[PDB]
Design a protein around this ligand. Structure first.
Ligand SMILES: [Mg+2]
Lengths: 185, 160
């Protein structure tokens, strides 16, 4: 069971998050227990999305990240660029051997944390300039998603759907991913 | 501001419900105070979506259904075909002319009045949709009607 958790930041792109989840759930629909996932919050059991809706989430536990294969930072247009704690948290997750990710502008955070050094990534245009300024060793891919080793990132909802399809393809084959796509699309 | 409220039933289609909300929030981005909305629950302040995620909602209230210009029934595949209160309450809302709608198979509950056979359709003041994509056009038509093709076309360019 590939374990992936999503850190939902305030004003996170709901469409980015829900489409990525759809892919992982639909994958399970055709192939049992392929993925285990959990929405996570840095502070609280509720996170507000860019749609005004709040989602219930588990309060992140530095310890309970240990059993993870992938930690994804979910941001959005109005997502505040703070959360200084994410820097050592992601660095340690990177040291531990975890794959790391970001939707919409989550790559900005992976960038500041120094975990995209000599890696490609996708990020929303609004934060492209800052990401390059803070992380010179990070390359900006001229496309909506990026699958570079253990660094997965997307700049848009569609990029996020392709990103998780890329993940499904890399783990269980073109067969499952192609099947997942048929249902969703 | 036009008022639309969504009743989220257990296992409701998240994708279906979210894209609908996207159209409205987006319209508000292009034209302030265009819409107002609230997710509603028959029991508890939390509802399990079809994706395993739970959204915080507001428990349904009759006295509240006074400033509502539209009410929608959001359902999903594994959603149970029950909820008795959906007869008195729906008919009561129709008893006020109030607009009513349904997403995915939330039209079935509409059938207790007027593959769950029983993508979208806008019939006078009774809206419907049987797919996430149908939910999009559904709310786009709502905008096209209450505000025109201009604002409606603008929203369509953003979501995609
Ligand atoms: Mg720092």
């Amino acid at each position: 069971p590939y374990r992936v958790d999503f850190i939902l930041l305030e004003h996170f792109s709901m469409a980015s998050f829900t489409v990525a989840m759809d892919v992982l759930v639909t994958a399970n629909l055709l192939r049992a227990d392929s993925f285990q996932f959990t929405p996570l919050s840095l502070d609280g059991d509720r996170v507000l999305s860019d749609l005004g809706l709040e989602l219930v989430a588990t309060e992140l536990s530095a310890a309970a990240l240990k059993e993870l294969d992938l930690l994804v930072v979910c941001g959005g247009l109005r997502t505040p660029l703070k959360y200084p704690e994410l820097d050592r948290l992601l660095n340690d997750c990177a040291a531990h051997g975890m794959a790391l990710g970001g939707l919409w502008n989550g790559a900005w955070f992976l960038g500041r944390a120094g975990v995209l050094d000599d890696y490609g990534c996708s990020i929303h245009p609004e934060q492209r300039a800052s990401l390059s300024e803070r992380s010179p060793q990070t390359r900006i891919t001229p496309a909506s998603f990026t699958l570079d080793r253990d660094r997965l990132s997307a700049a848009s909802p569609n990029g996020a759907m392709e990103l998780m399809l890329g993940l499904v393809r890399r783990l269980y084959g073109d067969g499952l991913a192609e099947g997942v796509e048929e249902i969703l699309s």
